[PDB]
Every structure is written in C-alpha cells, then in structure tokens.
Design goal:
This is part of a larger assembly, with chains A (about 110 residues), B (about 55 residues), C (about 100 residues), D (about 45 residues) and E (about 120 residues). With about 100 residues, chain C is α+β, with helices and mostly antiparallel strands. Chain C has helices spanning about 15-25, 40-50, and strands spanning about 10-15, 25-30, 55-60, 65, 75, 80-85. Chain E is globular, with a radius of gyration of 15 Å. Classes of the chains: A alpha+beta (about 110), B alpha+beta (about 55), C alpha+beta (about 100), D mainly alpha (about 45), E alpha+beta (about 120). The interface of A and B includes residues 17 and 37 of A. Bound molecules: magnesium ion (29 copies). The structure holds one RNA strand of 160 nucleotides.
RNA sequence: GAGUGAGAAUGCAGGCAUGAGUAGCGAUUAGGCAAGUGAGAACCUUGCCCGCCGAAAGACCAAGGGUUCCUGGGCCAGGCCAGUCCGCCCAGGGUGAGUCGGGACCUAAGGCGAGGCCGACAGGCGUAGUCGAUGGACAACGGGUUGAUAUUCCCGUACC
C-alpha cells in the first residue's frame, strides 16, 4: 500500500452528472495537469472540483508532509445528495414540482514515485 | 408524443456517455522573466504583452 | 389606595441620531405609556423637572414582526413623545447626553 | 378583456359582515361561536 | 465591408448601427477596450473606415465622420492626434487579442486596441 | 388469543427513477464602453452616448397590505443564472397636527329595537328611539432642513 490523503466537500450546489462531466476529465492524472485542466475547462463545476483538488493537495502537503510534485489523483467521484424541494406554478393553474439537486464530491490523492 | 416504457440502464447510460468534454493542450511562453501557460491562440499576444492572465 | 401623580407615565428617554438632532434644538424625546395624553405628560414633565414647556408632540410606533423558528413573533407597540422646552432653555442634566 | 377575480377585499365589509357582533346578534351565530370555542380555534372570528 | 453573414449581432439594423457607433466612439476615445470577440471582429471594418476617412483631412471628411459617429470631441481628437499619426501606415489600424472567457456566460472576449508601435 | 402472511384494486402516505441535462427562463424598448468596490462583475455602484414610455411605463390619494421605508452587516435558503445587489435574511433607526382624514354634530337606502301585535315553541314584525356616509355644517401657505419625514418640524405672517 502507498500513503494517501482524502478530502471532500459535500452539499455543493451542482448537479451530480453535471459535475461528473468535469470529474471524468481528471481521473488518473497528476495534480499539476489536474490544476491546469480545471483552470482551463470553462464549466461551473470546474470551480468546486478545482477547490476540492487544491484543498486535498494542501492537506497532503501539510498533514503528511508529502512532496506535491509526485501526487496523483487516485480515485475521484461525485454522489448525489439531499435534494431541495420546491414548487413551480405552470399553465392552467395546475402545479408541478422542481427538484433542486445537490451533489457530493470526494477526492483522494496518492503519491506515486516516478 | 410521449414515452410509454422506461428506457433501460444500458440505453440511458450508453447515450449519456458520449456527452463529454475534451482537454486541450497548453503553451509555455517566456514573458517578463516568467514562463506562463496560454492556449496557442495567445502565443504572439503573450510574447508581445497584449493579453491579461490573472 | 392610590393618588394622582403626574410622573406615573414616563417610561424612558430614547437615544438616536435623530434624538441628538433634536437635543441640539432644545427639543426632547421621551417614551410614554400608550394610555397617556399630551396634557398629562406636559404637567408631568413640568412638575418633575421644574421647566416650563411649550407643547408636546406624540406619535405611535407599531411593533415590528421578527422571524423566529418557533413561530410568528411580534414585539410590543410603543408611543414616543416629542417635547420642546421654552426659550428659557434649561438643559435636563438627567438625560445623560 | 375581463380578468377581474372573485375576491375583492375590504376589511370594513369583512368586519361588519363576518364580525363577532354579527355572530352574536343572532342565536345561530352564538351557536357557531360556541362550537368554534369548543373546538379550540385561535381566531374565533374574522 | 462584407455584411455579417448570419442573423445580425445585436438583433436589428438600427440597433447594430447604434451599437457599432458607440463602440467606435468609446474605442477611439479610450484606446484599449475589452469586448465580445465577434463584436470586435465586426468592429474592425467600421474603425478602419474611420481611419481611412481621417487620413485625408478636409471639410467633407469632417462632415462624413460627424454623420457617422456623433461626437464633436471624439471627431476632433480623431482628426487631431489619430489622423496624422497614421499618415505613413497603409491598413492594419486595430489589433484583436482574446482574453479569458467571461464568467457570466462563457462568452469569448477579445481586447481590441489601436496599433501604437509607430 | 389474534389488527397474524400483498404483487396488483386508474389504492393510500413517504422516498427515488426515465422522458433529460430535452423544452422553457415570462413580450410588441436595446444597449456598449470606461473607471471604482469586490476572491468572482453584462447584470451592483459612479461617469458619457444610445434606446423606450411620457394622458405614462410620470407625480399624488382612497380601498387594500403592514414595516416591504432608511441606515449598517452578511449571500448556504428565496430572485427562473453568478450575484458584492434585492421588495433575501440580522440589528438599529424612522411616522410630531386645535386648522389634513373619522369620533365629541346630523341624516338617506338599510340594520337593531323597550313597550305592543302576531305566532305550539324556537321566533317574525315594527312605534318612541337608537345605529348606519358613499352626503351636509365647521378653521393655511412660501421657503428651509439631514442619510431617510413634511400643508405636521423651524422661520415669516394669519385664520376660524
Ligand atoms: Mg472558471
Ligand atoms: Mg400633539
Ligand atoms: Mg419572518
Ligand atoms: Mg387484519
Ligand atoms: Mg409492498
Ligand atoms: Mg400498488
Ligand atoms: Mg393514470
Ligand atoms: Mg422520467
Ligand atoms: Mg431541443
Ligand atoms: Mg430552448
Ligand atoms: Mg416572468
Ligand atoms: Mg461589469
Ligand atoms: Mg411612446
Ligand atoms: Mg391615455
Ligand atoms: Mg400627454
Ligand atoms: Mg384602502
Ligand atoms: Mg389600512
Ligand atoms: Mg429598500
Ligand atoms: Mg447588509
Ligand atoms: Mg448567498
Ligand atoms: Mg433558490
Ligand atoms: Mg433585514
Ligand atoms: Mg325593528
Ligand atoms: Mg322588548
Ligand atoms: Mg323603528
Ligand atoms: Mg345611528
Ligand atoms: Mg356616514
Ligand atoms: Mg408622509
Ligand atoms: Mg405636509
């Protein structure tokens, strides 16, 4: 087994599959390429994911004293969370519901020697 | 028209999996003594000093 | 039993930036029980502070309605009174600036 | 272009018409107030 | 110049006329502005036509530039410090450089400015 | 001894799916640029043009609502988007009348009603009266004020 550190941000106001779109672009890459891709991918979900990756890198560098140049993303995944419930008026006075979705984000980082 | 039956796991996920994004390449430029990263659209602009990067 | 005294009415003075904009102009602000009247408050202030006042203006401020998880909350209704002393101009040191 | 709706409020109509005194003026209204009081409503009358 | 091929930028002929006049005036007043990249693409012909008119100073060109862009201040500065300053340069008066995409709607912005090399 | 065995009754209540990141984002007016705050700015703030209403899409009142008014703080929840902004939420402040609107004045349509009449009963009528404005009698202007209030506060002059 190899040393690893984890960091997550729950209750983030993005859709699960919509954040997973961006998340699929970072699996298995090094942290530097990850930061570059998240900076240069024009998506709203790019901000929370990049923040989570940056926080995880900070935790790995501080708590365990690992060298950031050798860290790589081991597994990253988003799971749907509690959904805020709302109501919307529609035509003919008849009413439909709006499901305000919320997602979880999990990032664990692994340090792999070259 | 409306659907009359639930489209299955395989159909839904197979259709959805094609919708993705593509990661682009980056360009290193030597400006002001620092090497910073732009897309190739901005290589000349970076060397001359006409593009703003935070 | 109970006898009639004029200074069973005043609740408090009120401190505010407008209250100071009035304190500079020899006009004062007091908090007064709702069932009062300008004549009663005039007699009260004259007797208590030995100053001869000209006229008193009164206003009612409806209570606000403050949010709380327990439920719908409403504060109490208050009556403010505006008083203006005469040209004699005797400051009330009990106001405490 | 008619769109004027049913409920056109007036607190003066409301109070003189569904008021406590209009209730108490007739015996049926007293019966209604007693029934409501037995039930335990917070607002007895409109 | 060649008209915009598709449905027009702002949504009508009068609207784009006013929009383009305002962009040209603000750009000539200031020197360097940041705007939508296709907007700068469509801006290029108008500012270049103004530079063409400016190159040859005369009363008819005074009135032509006035009827185009509606500001005595900007036309005066255009005829006084921009005009003669491009006397020896034939074409190529504006530079388009795009920048980080917008946060509001991810529209590509480009920084368009006069050439001040000479 | 049983409220004792569900898979269905267009069953009931709770939760979660696909249709799907698809349609729509609420008009006949339209913006762009600069500087400023801010971690983030088309959407907020300030400046210049452009656009639209202008018998209104401006300014006041009544009915109606009740703090949405102003100031300061913050932006997970609400605004069909981010939002430093908000009619969001937290705290504080703000409504000053002998003369403006009602009561101490009076009545219309109509309501209540002592006695009284009628009605098995509960009740229904209406006299003297008393209620009931959408009516009538009866007393103001100019200017100034701070960050929010002005025919109310102050100055000046009057009224009944
Ligand atoms: Mg971004
Ligand atoms: Mg008074
Ligand atoms: Mg509340
Ligand atoms: Mg049973
Ligand atoms: Mg079951
Ligand atoms: Mg069933
Ligand atoms: Mg059905
Ligand atoms: Mg579905
Ligand atoms: Mg479609
Ligand atoms: Mg559409
Ligand atoms: Mg709408
Ligand atoms: Mg901006
Ligand atoms: Mg018009
Ligand atoms: Mg009209
Ligand atoms: Mg007119
Ligand atoms: Mg009203
Ligand atoms: Mg009211
Ligand atoms: Mg406000
Ligand atoms: Mg605040
Ligand atoms: Mg917020
Ligand atoms: Mg919401
Ligand atoms: Mg608040
Ligand atoms: Mg009667
Ligand atoms: Mg009787
Ligand atoms: Mg009678
Ligand atoms: Mg009456
Ligand atoms: Mg009346
Ligand atoms: Mg007012
Ligand atoms: Mg006034």
């Amino acid at each position: 087994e190899f040393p690893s550190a984890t960091a997550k941000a729950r209750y983030v106001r993005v859709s699960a599959t919509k954040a997973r779109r961006v998340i699929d672009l970072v699996r298995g890459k090094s942290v530097e390429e990850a930061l570059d891709i998240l900076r240069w991918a024009p998506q709203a979900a790019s901000e929370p994911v990049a923040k989570v990756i940056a926080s995880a890198a900070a935790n790995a560098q501080n708590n365990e004293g690992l060298d950031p140049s050798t860290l790589v993303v081991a597994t990253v995944y988003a799971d749907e969370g509690p959904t805020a419930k709302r109501i919307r008026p529609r035509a003919q006075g008849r009413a439909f519901r709006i499901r305000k979705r919320t997602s979880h984000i999990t990032v664990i980082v692994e340090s792999r020697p070259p | 028209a409306v659907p009359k039956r639930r489209m299955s796991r395989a159909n839904t996920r197979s259709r959805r999996a094609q919708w993705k994004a593509e990661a682009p390449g980056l360009v290193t430029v030597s400006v002001a003594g620092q090497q910073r990263k732009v897309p190739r659209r901005l290589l000349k602009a970076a060397r001359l000093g006409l593009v703003d990067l935070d | 039993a109970t006898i009639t005294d004029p200074r069973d009415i005043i609740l408090a003075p009120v401190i505010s930036e407008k209250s100071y904009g009035l304190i500079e102009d020899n006009v004062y602000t007091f908090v007064v029980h709702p069932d009062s009247n300008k004549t009663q408050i005039k007699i009260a202030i004259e007797k208590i502070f030995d100053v001869k006042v000209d006229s008193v203006n009164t206003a009612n401020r409806q209570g606000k309605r403050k949010r709380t998880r327990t439920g719908f909350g409403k504060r109490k209704s208050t009556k403010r009174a505006i008083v203006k002393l005469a040209a004699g101009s005797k400051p009330i040191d009990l106001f405490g600036a | 272009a008619k769109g004027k709706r049913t409920f056109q409020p007036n607190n003066r109509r409301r109070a003189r018409v569904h008021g406590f005194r209009l209730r108490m003026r007739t015996r049926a209204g007293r019966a209604i107030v007693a029934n409501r009081r037995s039930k335990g409503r917070r607002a007895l009358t409109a | 110049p060649k008209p915009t091929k598709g449905p027009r930028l702002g949504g009508s002929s009068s609207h784009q006329s006013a929009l383009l006049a305002n962009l040209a005036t603000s750009l000539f007043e200031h020197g360097r502005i940041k705007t939508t990249e296709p907007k700068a693409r469509a801006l290029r012909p108008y500012a270049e036509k103004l530079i063409t008119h400016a190159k040859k100073g005369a009363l008819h060109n005074r009135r032509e530039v006035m009827k185009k862009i509606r500001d005595k201040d900007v036309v005066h500065t255009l005829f006084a410090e921009i005009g003669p300053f491009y006397a020896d340069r034939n074409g190529g008066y504006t530079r388009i450089i795009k920048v980080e995409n917008r946060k509001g709607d991810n529209a590509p912005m480009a920084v368009i400015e006069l050439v001040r090399e000479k």
